[PDB]
Curated annotation (Swiss-Prot), chains A, B, C:
The gene is ADIPOQ. Homomultimer. Forms trimers, hexamers and 12- to 18-mers. The trimers (low molecular weight complexes / LMW) are assembled via non-covalent interactions of the collagen-like domains in a triple helix and hydrophobic interactions within the globular C1q domain. Several trimers can associate to form disulfide-linked hexamers (middle molecular weight complexes / MMW) and larger complexes (higher molecular weight / HMW). The HMW-complex assembly is also modulated by the degree of lysine hydroxylation and glycosylation. This is Adiponectin. The record marks N111 as: Not glycosylated. HMW-complex blood contents are higher in females than in males, are increased in males by castration and decreased again upon subsequent testosterone treatment, which blocks HMW-complex secretion. In type 2 diabetic patients, both the ratios of HMW to total adiponectin and the degree of adiponectin glycosylation are significantly decreased as compared with healthy controls.
Length: 125, 125, 125
């Protein structure tokens, strides 16, 4: 059971209020990261590890890791960071088939920023 | 073989000289992280990956990752960071049954801070 | 299939223009990290996760994660960070037998810095 991705941006600060569209692709063999939207689509249910290191050239930075719960049919910020120019973070999240995870930043308009996730434990039922 | 946890705090700077008691729980299905103490208890021996991203609102910050060696019957700082407001780190540690791992900070009294660990390789004997 | 390492330095800023020779060893049971050179040697082909948290006491810092592609017979910077005193990063990289991965920093001459990697998915053919 394989499902992983690692993507980059190579810029200072992308556009806010939208999913960060990471263009640079370090790994994406299962094609579970959508480069056209910046969202990771879960196709294998289980526990996933997400890690990111984002640089931001904005004021009042607000970094959020979103999860769209497919079964609950609603989106929420599973993780949030505030007022940090160089925001780093990592978290474990359990995902179901259809769930979506992506990164988002908010700030006021006035370096490799990464976003990595992989399946650690797959569900066994 | 599953053993993982990912926990948060959602505050600026917790209390020093004691294990950081992470209240927010992102994942804890094996119930190996003690929310009442902030210590992870190893129940499966093997190689574990620990990662943390702590924000601190204190002076002369001192971030330490402690390991209580059950067999050696003594506690030591397996990792330490000094004079960093936004401390990030990750490390691989081999643990035995009964070992304990936790985070601790020291500073002078005057944002999601995470602490994640999971079993990478379990011992085979 | 096991192949992992986690190493430290315990200093402020090592020497530039050369692979960072991490002397402190948190884990190295497969002996795939060369302490005399600072390079990780891949002996099991597959997808590897690399994470690092380097502190630097230099000006115009330039942190790079190098990969020597054994089959292509050439070395390139798989990851790069610029003008960051406390540089953190993580990435997934696929490696073949003979590939080498190491960290490198550039700066102008005027705290635990870690470097961790482990085999996530091994190739199955
Ligand atoms: Cl990290």
């Amino acid at each position: 059971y394989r499902s992983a991705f690692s993507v980059g941006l190579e810029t200072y600060v992308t556009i806010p209020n939208m999913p960060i569209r990471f263009t640079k692709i370090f790994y994406n063999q299962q094609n579970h990261y959508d480069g056209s939207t910046g969202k990771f689509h879960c196709n294998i249910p289980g526990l996933y590890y997400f890690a990111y290191h984002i640089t931001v050239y904005m004021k009042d930075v607000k970094v959020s890791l979103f999860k769209k719960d497919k079964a609950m049919l609603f989106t929420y910020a599973a993780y949030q960071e505030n007022n940090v120019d160089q925001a780093s973070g990592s978290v474990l999240l359990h995902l179901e088939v259809g769930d979506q995870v992506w990164l988002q930043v908010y700030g006021e308009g006035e370096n490799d920023s990464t976003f990595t996730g992989f399946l650690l434990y797959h569900d066994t039922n």
